[PDB]
Design a protein around this nucleic acid. Structure first.
Ligand code: MG
Ligand code: MG
Ligand code: MG
Ligand code: MG
Ligand code: MG
Ligand code: MG
Ligand code: MG
Ligand code: MG
Ligand code: MG
Ligand code: MG
Ligand code: MG
Ligand code: MG
Ligand code: MG
Ligand code: MG
Ligand code: MG
Ligand code: MG
Ligand code: MG
Ligand code: MG
Ligand code: MG
Ligand code: MG
Ligand code: ZN
Lengths: 37, 213, 174, 58, 146
RNA sequence: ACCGCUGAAAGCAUCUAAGCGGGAAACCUUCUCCAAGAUCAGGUUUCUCACCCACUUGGUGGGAUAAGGCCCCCCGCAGA
RNA sequence: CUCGAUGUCGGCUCGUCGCAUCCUGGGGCUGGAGCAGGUCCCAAGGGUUGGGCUGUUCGCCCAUUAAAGCGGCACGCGAGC
């Protein structure tokens, strides 16, 4: 996981959601997932 | 499950085991005990059993304590202590007036021994808490066994509670865990327990079957 | 759109409604449920199930489809249960059924044993294929996931436990 | 305040209503009355309530 | 001279407040007012007027879920690093009456009278109290429309 | 932290919004010690369970006892 | 602020706290085959060596170690040396 104050999708298939009051990106490619922090 | 007995520390000696290894043991005369009382959860709020140990002249017991013993129909003893059982009574395994001897334990089992450690009087920090002190030479002035600093400075302008200083040492309640019962001599009512036991020779000792085992 | 559908009743032998609560029994055992407050469960013209709620609120549009699909899953499972098929990969990795429990050989020094809880029945077909069965979809999925995570993912060789037809990621490494 | 709320009215509206009714007794004697003669205090509360406007939010 | 209560004028009574769905703050304010006796026209700030209050069903008080999760209770033992810390959730599981009485006591004046005023408070987790011999009247919370 | 199951808003998907799991020497019980001056001063028991005088007749002042202590005496591996 | 006085570096003794974590504990990603690692997230319970040189702090070196953490407290601590 990447943890940076700015998160945004990288490739075309990165979805961007917000679970438990925290913005994060989930994607099939495991090295793409990010969460704000 | 929890088994207990009251006895007297008779001193230490050594024996040799089957491997021809020397074993330092403490001789505990786990003499006969009488029950004298049962604590039920319904009446007291917890489950436990009193135990009476030690011989004493009946003229040495006042009227209230004598009445308590008479209520149980037992001749008065010197000592009296409660063995706390698990929060389940099971309402069994103990009768008032029943006798407990030393062979409630068996060879090779483990016990917890609690007693009253020896008194050391007013002790310094070097003995009581293992402080280092300052050096014996190179200019040290009258501080060889003194404690050193006891706090900070203007912040905080106080000494913290629980700072270790000199004071009375010993006479505490001490429990030693996982002592191996080397031999149970039922003839003399004697337990040979491998290791050391808190207290002076002749002091009251409580022996309990170990819970850590 | 989900939640704006009636729930058909193949059997629904003992469909009962008591203050946002419901119980359904049939060819298999019974299953209960309590519906969220702003949702109303009611009957259709053909004895079916329908749910409703006051219109156009975020908290109600969210609960609508959820409460619909939960009772739909419940009745579906009562009619026919849920089964999940799981494979095993890797040389020497295998599974056997030991009474009510289920044993795994997954390269550990010790063996791994999974006990089946109530309402769940295991069934082995081949030394490398088995199936977890039950009526409650959530419980079946939970047990399947517990069995799924028995080994850490292996992108290089691929050994471990997988679902049927799932495509795990692969890397070459050396 | 205690006596008024016992007679089901706030000190707030009791003072407004007494001034509207044109009663010029001061607080020392109102408190004295509340301690000594609760029937008279109830009568005063009735007068204040009667003189108070019908809707107090207009 | 304005009236000042004399020794022997104060008359006490017994109230029982049910905490089934009352929120903690409302219940605490009500109990504090009853204990101090501010509802009595004979009130005096230097006199321990007021009544006895029995609070039952202390485990039913309405506490928000986020408050159970996040409202935190602190005690310092006096030793370095001796700040110990619980949640309202753990307290409500273990000693529910302590939560109610702590909330009530925070709302009393911080002086010597409140030490004696808090002696008249009884809080119970269950639905029953042992003071049946005293005949406490039920007390529901009212708000005076204005 | 992280990994999930079931699952809408948003016909798909989503660990989450309803709900249910796994998860660390940190936290709480469990082990050891202190502790009812815990002034909400706790509990289970057992013993004494009794008088006299004065008086402004008082939840009054004195006097003498019980159960039980204390001081004194002989000591201690208890101890300034 | 303190000049009708608030003792100044280093060492010793005794500590206490923070976490921006050195080890041990838990994880995600990896240009992670395995052993080893890199990076980021969680985590402050305990631990965190002895010497040579220099007044030294610092630093370098020697021999080990799971590791030889960084800081605050009048650059903690002279009515304690
Ligand atoms: Mg020395
Ligand atoms: Mg000198
Ligand atoms: Mg000198
Ligand atoms: Mg000297
Ligand atoms: Mg200070
Ligand atoms: Mg999913
Ligand atoms: Mg205290
Ligand atoms: Mg100066
Ligand atoms: Mg001066
Ligand atoms: Mg951190
Ligand atoms: Mg890593
Ligand atoms: Mg490699
Ligand atoms: Mg630590
Ligand atoms: Mg701990
Ligand atoms: Mg330091
Ligand atoms: Mg300094
Ligand atoms: Mg000096
Ligand atoms: Mg110095
Ligand atoms: Mg100084
Ligand atoms: Mg000074
Ligand atoms: Zn992606």
């Amino acid at each position: 996981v990447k943890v940076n104050p700015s998160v945004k999708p990288i490739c075309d298939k990165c979805r961007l959601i917000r679970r438990h009051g925290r913005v994060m990106v989930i994607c099939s490619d495991p090295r793409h997932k990010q969460r704000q922090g | 499950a929890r088994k207990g007995i009251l006895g007297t520390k008779l001193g230490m000696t050594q024996v040799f085991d089957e491997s021809n290894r020397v074993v330092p043991v403490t001789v505990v005369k786990a003499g006969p005990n009488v029950v004298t009382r049962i604590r039920t959860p319904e009446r007291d709020g917890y489950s436990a059993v009193q135990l009476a140990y030690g011989e004493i002249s009946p003229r040495k017991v006042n009227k209230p304590l004598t009445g308590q013993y008479t209520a149980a129909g037992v001749n008065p003893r010197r000592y009296l202590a409660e063995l706390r059982l698990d929060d389940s009574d099971a309402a069994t395994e103990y009768q008032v007036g029943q006798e407990l001897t030393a062979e409630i334990f068996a060879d090779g089992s483990y016990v917890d021994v609690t007693g009253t450690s020896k008194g050391k009087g007013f002790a310094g920090t070097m003995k009581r808490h293992g402080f280092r002190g300052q050096g014996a030479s190179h200019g040290a002035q009258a501080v060889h066994r003194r404690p050193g600093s006891i706090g900070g400075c203007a912040t905080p302008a106080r000494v913290f509670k629980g700072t270790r200083m000199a004071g009375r040492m010993g006479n505490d309640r001490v429990t030693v865990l996982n002592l191996l019962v080397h031999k149970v001599d039922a003839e003399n009512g004697v337990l040979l327990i491998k290791g050391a036991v808190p207290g002076r020779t002749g002091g009251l000792v409580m022996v309990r079957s170990a819970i850590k085992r | 759109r989900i939640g704006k559908q009636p729930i058909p009743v193949p059997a629904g032998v003992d469909v009962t409604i008591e203050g946002q609560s419901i119980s359904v029994k049939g060819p298999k055992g019974t299953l209960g449920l309590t519906v969220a407050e702003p949702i109303k469960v009611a009957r259709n013209d053909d004895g079916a199930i329908v749910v409703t709620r006051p219109d156009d609120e975020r908290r109600n549009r969210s609960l609508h489809g959820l409460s619909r699909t939960l009772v739909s899953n419940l009745v579906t499972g009562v009619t026919q249960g849920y089964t999940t098929k799981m494979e095993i990969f890797g040389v020497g990795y295998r599974v056997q059924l030991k009474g009510s429990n289920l044993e795994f050989a997954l390269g550990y020094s010790h063996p791994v044993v999974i006990e089946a809880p109530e309402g769940i029945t295991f069934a082995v077909q081949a030394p490398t294929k088995f199936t977890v069965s039950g009526i409650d979809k959530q419980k079946v999925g939970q047990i399947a996931a517990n069995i799924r995570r028995l080994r850490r993912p292996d992108p290089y060789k691929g050994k471990g436990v997988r679902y049927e037809g799932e495509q795990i990621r692969r890397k070459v490494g050396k | 305040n205690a006596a008024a709320r016992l007679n089901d009215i706030t000190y707030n509206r009791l003072i407004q209503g007494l001034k509207a009714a044109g009663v010029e007794v001061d607080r020392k004697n109102l408190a004295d009355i509340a301690i000594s003669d609760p029937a008279a205090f109830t009568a005063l509360v009735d007068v204040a309530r009667a003189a108070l406007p019908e809707d107090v939010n207009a | 001279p304005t009236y000042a209560p004399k020794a022997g004028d104060t008359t006490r009574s017994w109230y029982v407040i049910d905490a089934t769905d009352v929120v903690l703050g409302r219940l605490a304010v009500a109990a504090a007012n009853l204990l101090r006796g501010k509802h009595k026209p004979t009130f005096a700030p230097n006199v321990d007027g007021g009544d006895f209050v029995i609070v039952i069903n202390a485990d039913k008080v309405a506490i928000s879920g986020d408050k159970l999760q996040h409202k935190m209770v602190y005690r310092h033992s006096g030793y370095p690093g001796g700040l110990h810390k619980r949640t309202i959730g753990e307290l409500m599981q273990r000693h529910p009456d302590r939560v109610v009485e702590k909330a009530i006591l925070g709302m009393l004046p911080k002086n010597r009278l409140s030490r004696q005023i808090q002696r008249k408070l009884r809080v119970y987790a269950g639905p029953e109290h042992p003071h049946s011999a005293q005949q406490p009247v039920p007390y529901e919370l009212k708000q005076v429309a204005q």
